[PDB]
Structures are given as structure tokens and as C-alpha cells.
Design a protein around this ligand. Structure first.
Ligand SMILES: Nc1nc2c(ncn2[C@@H]2O[C@@H]3COP(=O)(O)O[C@H]4[C@@H](O)[C@H](n5cnc6c(=O)[nH]c(N)nc65)O[C@@H]4COP(=O)(O)O[C@H]3[C@H]2O)c(=O)[nH]1
Length: 285
């Protein structure tokens, strides 16, 4: 998907960043360009938002003939107080960039976009992109948390995918591969690890029965995509192990959870903490 590829591009730029520089500053032009692309924006600005939810007037990046952000514009204030996209529908749109913790990192202020995209469809896409960008900027904070980087990333991406589903009806899939045959477990796990692609993230765990469980989250992925992933995995497994071998004959038990705003609130817990035999110390947020 174009969104996934856009986010992968930005993530890679963030990984290629020298390391000393503040992420929002160094990639401000890119962030604005991305938001401009998806919103068909013509005049807009990107601003840093302080901890107390007040905006920094000095623009990080501008598009078109950008007029200065004044004192307390009603749209800017409502946006930052709600932590949500606000438009003057019914000085066009304000989009906050909010991480999975609810921290407003930045503000997109749009002065001009074509009226034919001044609608809920485009607003939703702007909001989706803003949330994902905000998450990507928070990688400079992992250095002060105890959990392994892979655990922090998995947690963040999972929460974002839960938010995507709840707020925007966007699809994602969780797979749990339970490795029940200890002869094959290590090599099966290594093959699963090597298969990781794009925004997918994995967690390597041991469940309450002492078995290897590899969790894989597939963000922004349709049901057709999630089935495509398994078809690709089966081809890889066939290459690696016998043609006369299936994932299942190597001891792999596959459990799948499709993220959806229809699923009951207790469902993910049942899946991970009962079915997969995991606990809240292993997976949370
Ligand atoms: N989340 C997730 N979904 C998966 C994965 N593997 C397969 N899929 C799903 O199954 C479709 C077909 O994958 P394919 O046969 O590898 O066919 C792919 C593959 O030939 C190529 N492609 C896409 N991304 C990559 C990549 O990161 N590396 C390589 N080498 N090829 C890619 O483009 C074709 C279509 O890609 P998509 O549009 O992404 O469409 C993908 C995607 O919807 C996965 O590891 N994670």
C-alpha cells in the first residue's frame, strides 16, 4: 500500500539520521511533504507543540504562501485541547501529530486545500498519517526504557494498530506461531525471523508451557494480505525444510487474530494470555 511504503520511507530516513539531531527538526520538510501529498494541500505549515499543548509560532516547514500563526486562533486552540483533527467545515484544518501515549508532538496547520478534498475521507487520511508519523519520531526515547528495543517497538506498533482499527476501521493481523516440537523449534523460529518484511514486527517469547512462540504483527494489512503472508511463508518453509514437510508437521501451531472494531474488548487478552499462554509481563500496550 502507498501508506505503508510512505511510512517505510520516513522510517528509513529516521534510521539513516546522523543520530545527534532532533528528528522533528531534521525531517520537518519530509513530514510536511507527506502530509501535503495525502491531503492535496496547497498552503500549510508544520509547527512544534510544547509539553503543555501550546504551539511554537516559528514554523518548522511551510508549503505555499504560508501566513504566520497568530496568538490564539480558535482552530489551533480547539485542535490542541482535543488532541484531534479539527476543521472549519459545515484556517481550514488543524491536524495534531499525536503519539500512542497521547503526546502532541507537532501541529499541521492548513490554510488552503482544494474544496473537493475538504471532506471526511481526506481528514481521515491526514489523521491516520499524522498518528503514524508521531510514533516514528519517538524512537529517540527507547534509550531510557528497560524493555528490549524489539519489545518496545512491538508494543508501540500493536497499540497504533489497535487505534487504527478502533478509530479508522483499518485492518491488521496478529499471528502467533507456537512451536511445539523442540527438535525443529530453533530453526523454524530463525526462518520466521528472517521472513520479516516492511512494517511487520515480531516478538520472540516462551509461553507458560515452555514453548517458543513467535508473535508477528502485520500493520495496515487487509485479510487478503494476511492470507498472502501465510502463502509466502509456506513457500519459504518448503524451500527451507522438506517439500514433504508442512509448517504443521514441524510442530508449528498457527493462531491468528484479526484486529477489528467489532471484536469484543476482552478478545485480544483471551488470544494472547489464554490461547497463546502468554502474560502481561511479555506483551502489553
Ligand atoms: N504484512 C505483510 N503482508 C505480506 C507479507 N508477505 C506477503 N504479504 C501479502 O501478500 C501479498 C503478496 O506477496 P508476495 O507474493 O510476496 O508478492 C509481493 C512481492 O513480490 C513484492 N513485494 C512487496 N513488498 C516487498 C518486500 O519488502 N520485499 C520484496 N522482495 N518484495 C516485495 O510485491 C508483491 C505484492 O506485495 P504487497 O502489495 O505487499 O502484497 C502482498 C501482501 O499483501 C508480509 O511479510 N507482511
Amino acid at each position: 500500500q502507498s501508506l505503508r511504503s510512505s511510512l517505510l520511507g520516513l522510517r528509513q530516513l529516521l534510521r539513516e539520521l546522523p543520530g545527534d539531531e532532533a528528528p522533528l527538526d531534521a525531517l520537518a520538510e519530509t513530514v510536511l511533504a507527506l502530509l501535503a501529498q495525502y491531503g492535496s494541500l496547497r498552503i500549510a505549515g508544520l509547527y512544534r507543540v510544547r509539553y503543555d499543548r501550546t504551539p511554537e509560532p516559528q514554523p518548522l516547514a511551510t508549503l505555499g504562501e504560508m501566513p504566520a500563526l497568530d496568538a490564539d486562533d480558535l482552530l489551533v486552540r480547539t485542535c490542541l485541547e482535543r488532541g484531534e483533527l479539527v476543521s472549519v467545515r459545515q484556517a481550514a484544518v488543524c491536524v495534531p501529530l499525536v503519539d500512542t501515549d497521547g503526546r502532541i508532538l507537532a501541529l499541521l496547520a492548513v490554510e488552503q486545500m482544494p474544496f473537493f478534498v475538504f471532506n471526511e475521507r481526506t481528514f481521515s487520511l491526514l489523521a491516520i498519517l499524522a498518528g503514524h508519523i508521531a510514533d516514528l519520531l519517538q524512537s529517540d526515547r527507547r534509550a531510557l526504557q528497560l524493555a528490549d528495543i524489539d519489545a518496545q517497538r512491538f508494543s508501540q506498533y500493536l497499540k497504533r494498530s489497535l487505534l487504527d482499527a478502533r478509530d479508522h476501521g483499518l485492518p491488521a493481523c496478529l499471528y502467533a506461531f507456537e512451536l511445539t516440537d523442540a527438535r525443529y523449534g530453533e530453526e523454524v523460529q530463525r526462518l520466521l525471523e528472517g521472513s520479516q518484511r516492511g512494517l511487520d514486527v515480531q516478538l520472540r517469547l516462551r509461553n507458560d508451557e515452555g514453548r517458543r512462540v513467535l508473535l508477528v504483527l502485520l500493520p495496515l494489512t487487509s485479510a487478503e494480505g494476511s492470507q498472502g503472508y501465510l502463502q509466502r511463508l509456506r513457500i519459504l518453509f518448503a524451500e527451507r525444510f522438506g517439500q514433504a514437510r508442512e509448517l504443521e508437521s514441524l510442530g508449528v501451531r498457527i493462531r491468528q487474530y484479526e484486529l477489528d472494531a467489532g471484536n469484543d474488548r476482552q478478545a485480544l487478552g483471551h488470544f494472547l494470555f489464554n490461547e497463546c499462554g502468554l502474560n502481561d509481563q511479555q506483551v502489553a500496550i
